[PDB]
Design a protein around this ligand. Structure first.
Ligand SMILES: Nc1nc2c(ncn2[C@@H]2O[C@H](COP(=O)(O)OP(=O)(O)O)[C@@H](O)[C@H]2O)c(=O)[nH]1
Ligand SMILES: Nc1nc2c(ncn2[C@@H]2O[C@H](COP(=O)(O)OP(=O)(O)O)[C@@H](O)[C@H]2O)c(=O)[nH]1
Ligand SMILES: Nc1nc2c(ncn2[C@@H]2O[C@H](COP(=O)(O)OP(=O)(O)O)[C@@H](O)[C@H]2O)c(=O)[nH]1
Ligand SMILES: [Mg+2]
Ligand SMILES: [Mg+2]
Lengths: 316, 318
């Protein structure tokens, strides 16, 4: 039974999710409306055109096939279905589909500190997501320590320092080009000495050489295990949802190079390719855990596929 | 030995290719310049950063590995290589690499009896109908008689758009109504070309790739029905790809060529975009040739492909 990471939405939080998905929702409704103009009943041609719309909405081939198969079956049972019901049918069938992945949601604690290694390619929103996470945890009364283990560019450390100041959490850092594993070691040591609750490690994720990537991330993990044997407790892969299915393929490439435990999909706000979240949640054997809906430290949400699909497809 | 589709470039033609690739060339030079600031000699770190630049330039993983392997080897032989030479080294090594694909260029097959039948295929929006207009202009300018077939009949404006191009160039068109059987339109087109003693037939097609079974069946029916009239038609199946989408076009070509037999590639929209490096990866990896590149909206903005000149325009100092 799928247990979502976020079970309760405040009014403002559901509004933030609706707003984050607004452009994707409007784009999808535009495409379906145009596809069924002059049609009355859902037939094989309508479902063919709906498959084309779902693909054009970055839902992905394998997920779209499953969705159309479920709708085909439902249409065959009900015989006469009006095309105006498609948004409602999609909401119901896709919500049901996401609940079928046993790897979605939480699986339901280890000794502090809880160590998070944030991974992904440059530009997807890793460091921003780390700032948002630090805010999430500090708002709960937890003590957060950041580790600046993205040391390839000098700007990288500067950017995490900037976020450490926006939220008001300590940071462990060395120089540009310092050994990332050594920074991670120092970060976890400091967190243990300071009795901190959460450690978040920033990393480079230069995917062009998967051997070097694999070796760097494995060294970071192995060295942290000298201090905390079951660290990292979470390996969070950050993906740019504004790139649609490009993020799905990137996640496939990245998760084949290193062990990931959860996904974050950023930049859903103000872009129209958010349907990729549906395909990722359906196909991946690790959960979507966070979605990003803006530039500010509050613009992070724990994932709930049922609410995501509701916001994506409901009438506005 | 690779024989390019265009062997001689007039000065104006080389200028058109340079201009078409200007943004991709500037973008690449920006990336490599930034990557080697503060460096003097090419070392393993420089080559690693250069691999990242080539990937960021849409050249693709397999092609980039080959390029870096050759540069690694050349650096090892020469021991001391200045980072300023990277542009020259890339031009030389990538030019050599493209000549290694025996499927590149023309195979100089003996001519078949007129009409020469071209089926243009690809996904909506890549520039198929535009490319057909450009092809019609190319052939009419050579003194040939062109006939167009409006066998893209799904959407509202598809037939209208090919009519519009037939009028811009001034060539006849065979068409039916929206939703007409595309194979029947193709049959009528080839029949008309035979009776009019035409030299070239160009068939426009839909390419709804979301259901590859339906796509495969439609294109196969068009081919089979045209063979009732001209047994070796289509003589060319030209897959059009949008070069402004970079490696997305490489992946799309992989998906499309697995659904239907293609004989040649056209890569459009290189002008004014910065992802033209995908042409290098396509030419290296695909077992069908890049034959045409599109460098603009006008009927003249088509060139037969020459990989050596493409790489020269992509990497030469400006
Ligand atoms: N609109 C929006 N922008 C985001 C989101 N997450 C990250 N960004 C932006 O993405 C850009 C790159 O973020 P950064 O944290 O430096 O990416 P990194 O290279 O992966 O560490 C920044 O301008 C962020 O403001 C999001 O959820 N919404
Ligand atoms: N910052 C820091 N890093 C350390 C320290 N001790 C070990 N490390 C890290 O751990 C790595 C050594 O691991 P290694 O010797 O190969 O593992 P072992 O052979 O099984 O002991 C180094 O490369 C550092 O990154 C330390 O005192 N401080
Ligand atoms: N700049 C530029 N635009 C192009 C090129 N080829 C096609 N286009 C544009 O692409 C758009 C779609 O072209 P169209 O022929 O309708 O694509 P189709 O759906 O594949 O038939 C048109 O606006 C064309 O002007 C090119 O080489 N350069
Ligand atoms: Mg960062
Ligand atoms: Mg067209």
């Amino acid at each position: 039974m799928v247990s979502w990471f976020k079970k309760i939405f405040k009014k403002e939080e559901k509004e933030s999710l609706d707003k984050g998905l607004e452009k994707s929702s409007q784009s999808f409704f535009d495409k379906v409306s145009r596809a069924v103009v002059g049609k009355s009943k859902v037939d094989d041609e309508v479902l063919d055109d709906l498959e084309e719309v779902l693909i054009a909405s970055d839902v992905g081939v394998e997920t779209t096939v499953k969705i159309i198969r479920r709708i085909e079956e439902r249409v065959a049972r009900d015989k006469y279905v009006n095309v105006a019901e498609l948004n409602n049918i999609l909401r119901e069938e896709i919500s049901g589909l996401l609940l079928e992945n046993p790897h979605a949601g939480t699986q339901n604690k280890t000794k502090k500190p809880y160590v998070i290694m944030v991974v992904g390619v440059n530009g997807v929103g890793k460091t921003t997501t780390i700032g948002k996470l630090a805010h999430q945890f500090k708002s709960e009364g937890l003590k957060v320590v950041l580790g600046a283990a993205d040391t390839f560019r000098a700007a990288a450390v500067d950017q995490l320092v900037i976020w450490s100041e926006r939220v008001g959490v300590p940071i462990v850092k060395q120089a540009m080009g310092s050994d990332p594993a050594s920074v991670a070691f120092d970060t976890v040591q400091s967190a243990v000495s300071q009795d901190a609750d959460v450690v978040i490690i920033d990393t480079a994720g230069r995917l062009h050489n998967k051997v070097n990537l694999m070796n760097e991330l494995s060294k970071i993990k192995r060295v942290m295990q000298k201090v905390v044997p079951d660290a990292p407790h979470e390996v969070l892969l950050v993906l740019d949802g504004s790139t649609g299915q490009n993020a799905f393929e990137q996640a496939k490439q990245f998760t084949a190079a290193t062990e990931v435990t959860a996904l974050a999909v950023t930049k859903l706000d103000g872009t129209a390719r958010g349907g990729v979240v549906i395909g990722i949640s359906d196909q991946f054997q690790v959960p979507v855990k966070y979605i990003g809906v803006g530039e500010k430290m509050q613009d992070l949400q724990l994932f709930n596929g049922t609410e995501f699909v509701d916001s994506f497809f409901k009438k506005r």
